[PDB]
Amino acid sequence: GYSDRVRSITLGNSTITTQECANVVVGYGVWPDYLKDSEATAEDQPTQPDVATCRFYTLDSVQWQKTSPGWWWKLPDALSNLGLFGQNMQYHYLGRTGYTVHVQCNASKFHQGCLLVVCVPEAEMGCATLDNTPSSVELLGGDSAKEFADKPVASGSNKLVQRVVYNAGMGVGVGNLTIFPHQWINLRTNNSATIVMPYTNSVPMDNMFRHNNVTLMVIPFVPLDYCPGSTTYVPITVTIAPMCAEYNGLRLAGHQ
Amino acid sequence: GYSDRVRSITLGNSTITTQECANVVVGYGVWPDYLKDSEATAEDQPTQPDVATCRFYTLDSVQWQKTSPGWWWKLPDALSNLGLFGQNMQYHYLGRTGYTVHVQCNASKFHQGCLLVVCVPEAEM
Amino acid sequence: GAQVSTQKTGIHYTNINYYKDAASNSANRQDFTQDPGKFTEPVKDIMIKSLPALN
Amino acid sequence: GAQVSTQKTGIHYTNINYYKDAASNSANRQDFTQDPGKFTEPVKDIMIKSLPALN
Amino acid sequence: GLPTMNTPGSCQFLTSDDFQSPSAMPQYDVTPEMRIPGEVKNLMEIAEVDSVVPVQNVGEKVNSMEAYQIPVRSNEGSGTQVFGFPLQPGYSSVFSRTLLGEILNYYTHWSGSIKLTFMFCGSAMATGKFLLAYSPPGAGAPTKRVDAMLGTHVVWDVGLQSSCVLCIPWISQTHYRYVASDEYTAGGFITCWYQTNIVVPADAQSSCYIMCFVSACNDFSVRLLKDTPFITQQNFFQ
Amino acid sequence: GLPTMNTPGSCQFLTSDDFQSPSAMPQYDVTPEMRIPGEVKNLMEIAEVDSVVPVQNVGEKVNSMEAYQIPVRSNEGSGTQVFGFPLQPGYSSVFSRTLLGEILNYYTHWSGSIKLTFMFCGSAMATGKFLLAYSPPGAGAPTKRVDAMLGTHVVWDVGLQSSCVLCIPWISQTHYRYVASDEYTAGGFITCWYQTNIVVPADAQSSCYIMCFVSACNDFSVRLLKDTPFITQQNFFQ
Amino acid sequence: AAIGRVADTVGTGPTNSEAIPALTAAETGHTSQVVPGDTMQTRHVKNYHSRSESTIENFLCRSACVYFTEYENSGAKRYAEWVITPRQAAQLRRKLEFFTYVRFDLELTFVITSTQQPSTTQNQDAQILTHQIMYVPPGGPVPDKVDSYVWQTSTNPSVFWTEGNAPPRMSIPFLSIGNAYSNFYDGWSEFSRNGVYGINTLNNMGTLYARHVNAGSTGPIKSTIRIYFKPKHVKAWIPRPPRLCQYEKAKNVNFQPSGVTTTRQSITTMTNT
Amino acid sequence: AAIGRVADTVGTGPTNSEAIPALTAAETGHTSQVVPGDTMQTRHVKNYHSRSESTIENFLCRSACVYFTEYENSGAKRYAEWVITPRQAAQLRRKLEFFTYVRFDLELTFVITSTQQPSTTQNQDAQILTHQIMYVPPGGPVPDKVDSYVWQTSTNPSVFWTEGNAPPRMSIPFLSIGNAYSNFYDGWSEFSRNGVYGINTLNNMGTLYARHVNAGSTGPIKSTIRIYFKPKHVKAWIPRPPRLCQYEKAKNVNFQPSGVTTTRQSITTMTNT
Numbered sequence A: 001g002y003s004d005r006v007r008s009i010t011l012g013n014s015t016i017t018t019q020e021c022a023n024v025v026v027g028y029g030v031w032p033d034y035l036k037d038s039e040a041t042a043e044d045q046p047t048q049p050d051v052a053t054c055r056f057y058t059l060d061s062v063q064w065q066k067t068s069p070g071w072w073w074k075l076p077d078a079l080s081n082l083g084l085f086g087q088n089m090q091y092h093y094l095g096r097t098g099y100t101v102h103v104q105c106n107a108s109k110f111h112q113g114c115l116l117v118v119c120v121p122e123a124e125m126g127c128a129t130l131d132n133t134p135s136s137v138e139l140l141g142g143d144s145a146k147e148f149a150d151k152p153v154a155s156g157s158n159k160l161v162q163r164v165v166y167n168a169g170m171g172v173g174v175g176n177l178t179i180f181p182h183q184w185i186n187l188r189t190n191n192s193a194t195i196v197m198p199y200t201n202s203v204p205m206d207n208m209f210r211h212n213n214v215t216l217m218v219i220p221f222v223p224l225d226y227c228p229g230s231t232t233y234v235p236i237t238v239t240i241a242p243m244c245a246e247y248n249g250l251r252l253a254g255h256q
Numbered sequence B: 001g002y003s004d005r006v007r008s009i010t011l012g013n014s015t016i017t018t019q020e021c022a023n024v025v026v027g028y029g030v031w032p033d034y035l036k037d038s039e040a041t042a043e044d045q046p047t048q049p050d051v052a053t054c055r056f057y058t059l060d061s062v063q064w065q066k067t068s069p070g071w072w073w074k075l076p077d078a079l080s081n082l083g084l085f086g087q088n089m090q091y092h093y094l095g096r097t098g099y100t101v102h103v104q105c106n107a108s109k110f111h112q113g114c115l116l117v118v119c120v121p122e123a124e125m
Numbered sequence C, D: 001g002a003q004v005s006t007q008k009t010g011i012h013y014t015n016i017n018y019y020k021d022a023a024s025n026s027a028n029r030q031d032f033t034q035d036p037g038k039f040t041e042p043v044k045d046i047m048i049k050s051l052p053a054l055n
Numbered sequence E, F: 001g002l003p004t005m006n007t008p009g010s011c012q013f014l015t016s017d018d019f020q021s022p023s024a025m026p027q028y029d030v031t032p033e034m035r036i037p038g039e040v041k042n043l044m045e046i047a048e049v050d051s052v053v054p055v056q057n058v059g060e061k062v063n064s065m066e067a068y069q070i071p072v073r074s075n076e077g078s079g080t081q082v083f084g085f086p087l088q089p090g091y092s093s094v095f096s097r098t099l100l101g102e103i104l105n106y107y108t109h110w111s112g113s114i115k116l117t118f119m120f121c122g123s124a125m126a127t128g129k130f131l132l133a134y135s136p137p138g139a140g141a142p143t144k145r146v147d148a149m150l151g152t153h154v155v156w157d158v159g160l161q162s163s164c165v166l167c168i169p170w171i172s173q174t175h176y177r178y179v180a181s182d183e184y185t186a187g188g189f190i191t192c193w194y195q196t197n198i199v200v201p202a203d204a205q206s207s208c209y210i211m212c213f214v215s216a217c218n219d220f221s222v223r224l225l226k227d228t229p230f231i232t233q234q235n236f237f238q
Numbered sequence G, H: 001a002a003i004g005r006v007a008d009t010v011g012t013g014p015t016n017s018e019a020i021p022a023l024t025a026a027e028t029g030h031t032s033q034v035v036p037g038d039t040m041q042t043r044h045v046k047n048y049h050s051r052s053e054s055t056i057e058n059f060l061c062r063s064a065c066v067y068f069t070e071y072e073n074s075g076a077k078r079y080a081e082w083v084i085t086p087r088q089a090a091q092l093r094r095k096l097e098f099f100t101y102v103r104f105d106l107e108l109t110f111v112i113t114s115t116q117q118p119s120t121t122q123n124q125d126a127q128i129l130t131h132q133i134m135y136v137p138p139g140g141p142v143p144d145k146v147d148s149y150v151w152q153t154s155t156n157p158s159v160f161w162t163e164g165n166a167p168p169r170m171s172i173p174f175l176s177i178g179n180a181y182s183n184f185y186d187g188w189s190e191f192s193r194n195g196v197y198g199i200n201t202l203n204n205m206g207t208l209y210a211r212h213v214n215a216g217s218t219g220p221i222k223s224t225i226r227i228y229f230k231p232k233h234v235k236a237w238i239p240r241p242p243r244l245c246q247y248e249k250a251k252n253v254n255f256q257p258s259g260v261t262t263t264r265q266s267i268t269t270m271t272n273t
């Protein structure tokens, strides 16, 4: 009596369950862990809130419509206003984390579709107008998804994002996003997607506002579809849990 | 070369110095320490911010005038808006702490006066 | 003190570093390590080929 | 008779002096000695950090 | 002065040479290394990772997610072809821009088996069996199911296990094949057929999609490093 | 004639090269060495020595001893800022011409904690406590005492021990910082405040001065040797 | 096998069990490990093919011209200057961008060539040209004229070359301020999320300056300096999709939306059309 | 640690004793030895940073152009002459003057370049130029003309170079008459405290002379000779404040009073203004 379809994850005062998941993808094989003394530079005693910061934060849901192109969330950012994890970002110059990203989305034996849940590290995005760079307000959606576009975005001295889905706003083949830790929610067999991401970056720690080392993207390759009778509102919810969060350089708050 | 007049206290990213203190009074002889497992009830994993919360927070100064009667501060409260110590109070139902209270006030060999710094537990008014 | 490695084939060669900085050394063209697992197969629960991926 | 030292890194290199005068040798870029005391701390009576400088 | 004698090649500058050269930063202390997740040692590590193939190049679809969709639906017959592309991991537009293909395009020769994983994205209630086949060159691409099954094939039955693999065994007269196009180096034809048509119940969509992933096997290798045709410019970017 | 083959770089002249070269004075007998006090082995030996910082750049004062004076006096309140400069040992005019700064300006990268020693030059009868603080970047420079004490700080109490140290711990996201200016490499803000205003008796000057010394800690280092911007010329001096 | 050899093909025979190598579930995020023998009878093959030319090192280790400008004998532009960057050339840049973070030493090679400019000067008799390339790390004095004191290079590193000789060359250590060069940076330079955005907020590799040391002839001459990069001792992390859309700007990833691939008739056409 | 490594950061915790690392007394002349852990809880940090590039040797060991003159094919100045000195260039001079006394060997490098002068000579056909640099130690016969017997150099050391070849180079021993080169000399040359004053009373390094060996062409040519110094095997004593005021004269420390630093608004301005 054991099925890999079932699973349960506990982190802090929060637990998640699935009865129809795939496996669980673990980063680049690496499992999150605090910073070793032989790999640090910040000389001050770090802070490890632990249970207070490394828990499951459930973001705003999103509707998957027969035509939705996709969504995305910058990671250090998507939680910058949730609980003490956010409070620690505001109060500290330096931060370091990994996350257990859990994307939920149930349908029924009668619906169909296939999402691609992926964690893209260092997802720098392009601009609609080749002479500028997207603005913060256009890139960051903090706890509320950012939508990809079904077709190109016009130029014209604006600071918009080239949200064309098949280009992942990075100017690359969207179908090659698999070289990144990922899973596929194929309503037919799947029902949720879990990915544990280890801290990634070219430095031991970084400022959590000024930089977004990972970007979560959900992108349907096979559009939702059902039949008259089957329910029409199929939401997609994202829950993310920080792991081994450390903060250095304490000072006055504010994300200025 | 040693004088009990001099002293220095470090807690987190903050240090304090004095060159004219008395001794240092330690609570009821007890020194602060986390809650032991045989003395707890709250079953959840507590949070110990440590350096982020156990640091020196300097409040608003106050003027000592020839007629000032005195001042007072409720403790869990006086810091409820300072840094992450406050943020943790707001986000949690339960909290537990001890404090190193340091009251500063220099004058000169020519002034005079005598303050009474005291920590009154459970000061219902 | 020179070193002596193997050339590429289907024999050896001698090398003596002449500079005080490792940056000056020739390329490391013979590191044939390989670890696909990090990318192909980063699953937490080992998946046995002959078995069903779900049950 | 050559010599063999260590290069700078985060391997060795061989050297053979070819001239009769030491002046002709390459620089001595690896002398990592250090003695701040001569400058910082040239006091006659040792000052113990944790102590008061005057009493 | 040790009697010496320069030989041809002297003073030249080969782009792929390999010599020692003085550091411009004598004794510079490099920043200590750090453990960064996912290091890469060989490009083949990447070429072994599946990436979604755009089987549906057809017209304007290349500018939408549809390029990655393989149309499957209930018919009034079986034997119907579902798709068909050649085995030109490097040249064919179907593969050329894949993870595997991108890499191949930086080399001149390739060798090894290839894996085509097919995921059925229909609905839980949808069923059916397909015939994934690989026909080595020599004759033409099979035009009927009855002619494709005469070659290397896998009869995939859709069920709880969503995906199914068609391992394209490296059959070839030479050890390596050209990444570029060449008939000597012909690789054969990969085709799919309906074994037993899609069969859904009422209230369940009868038109579905099948995704196709591609990746290299453990016997795959690439030779003769070259530049990609896929990237160009007219002037240094500003 | 030993077959040889010159490689790129041959015959060039790198300013930082390191080769052997024939002496123009064959067998010249150098003057015997002699024990000379205070030898120097590394520039960091110097960068560890305190030098007086000119916190008061303000206007014309740069042309007088006043540049090295920090004004402190009895007020009718506390919380008053006393000074505030950034952590740019290399760029900021406050440090740039210091012993530490001069050295930094011959390099491109720096790393390590820094010591700011503050000597109270008031009168024996003058008293008071100050709040020396260092706020890492990320937010703005603290504008009120109540916001500076939220960061790394030292409450200095003036007394028999004239000086007091504010050790600025090397907090940073990278191992090294640029000596030149760059916001990525931002270092934070160093500010001072009145903890408990100056309090002198009668017949004792109520306006005083505080000197500030700066020096490197034992974990300080510098990389990438470059030329100083601080020295220039138009023609060879005669 | 042989350190870099490839897997040998294991001979297989007829099967009829409940072992399902061929059936899997891509949703897991796991790539199948199937091999020929799993879905068809195979023979045994001792494979000697090596993956030697696919090592990160062999892939990025070839000199690549990343940029080039010119400066003239006389006139307006008598000296050249270039803010160091690998993103102005598309060839090398697309390879490096195959990975998120990278670390390597660099072999620098310079190809310096001169060409006589058309003029009306009588009896021109050029002397051999001697050039000077000089590197100025961020924060150092810059030359404002071909005879500025800055070309003293008491500390700045610089090469002096003379036409005719082999291309000047020199090694450069891994110069990052961090633990690895970053190829992408989804962040800003300001904590307010203002200022610069993207890779260019990290680029502070200083500037390169070239010039002649002598004018040579009375006539006018123009010199071109080609800068080549060659990564050595490479270490790369987190591979990413190869660049699809052509490059647009040098200081950001801005692109012009492109199709996923070239097209063809129908999903049945065995031809590239 | 590693010979040149830097101190590691010792992890520290809360304190409350009468130990006063932070309180000291600068009057002593002693620099505080405080470290992060002394005034704040620190973590432990294994620091691998090296101070390799700060050694006196690495700091002064880079070729530096200290001077350069020219001499022509024909005409008035057919040969050059230079009283040897490191104080005509400001770059290297400011570094050497970082220390009171210094001792080192010297690597000499010469960059010799020629340029055709504008004239009205028909059919010019220059032959390859060959130069001759010659050193004349204090007391030796000096050349009065490009064809003086002095260029025989039976004993004087001199190099012969030909355009096209690598820069001529040679090593020079520590030539001081004393136990170390003096960078400063607060004294006179006369016991009456008259005559010369300052560093120049010690400079007696002789003179350098350059010239062509052949005229080459019928046309006029001008040649520039750049002299580079590179201290090797350095030993330095008694560091001093770095030069603040620009250099004025080459034979003394004369300066034009300068401000201590650049200015800024107020002692509260976090900006360089």
Ligand SMILES: CCCCCCCCCCCCCCCC(=O)O
Pocket: E024, G084, G085, G086, G106, G108, G133, G134, G135, G157, G158, G159, G172, G175, G181, G182, G199, G202, G203, G204, G205
């Ligand atoms: C004459 C000395 C020349 C020295 C040449 C120095 C060139 C520096 C090269 C830096 C390399 C590639 C780095 C990209 C930087 C970034 O985006 O972070």
Ligand SMILES: CCCCCCCCCCCCCCCC(=O)O
Pocket: F024, H084, H085, H086, H106, H108, H133, H134, H135, H157, H158, H159, H172, H175, H181, H182, H199, H202, H203, H204, H205
């Ligand atoms: C062709 C032979 C050339 C020999 C070059 C000799 C140059 C002598 C260099 C003396 C070095 C620096 C000394 C400063 C002298 C002083 O002020 O005491």
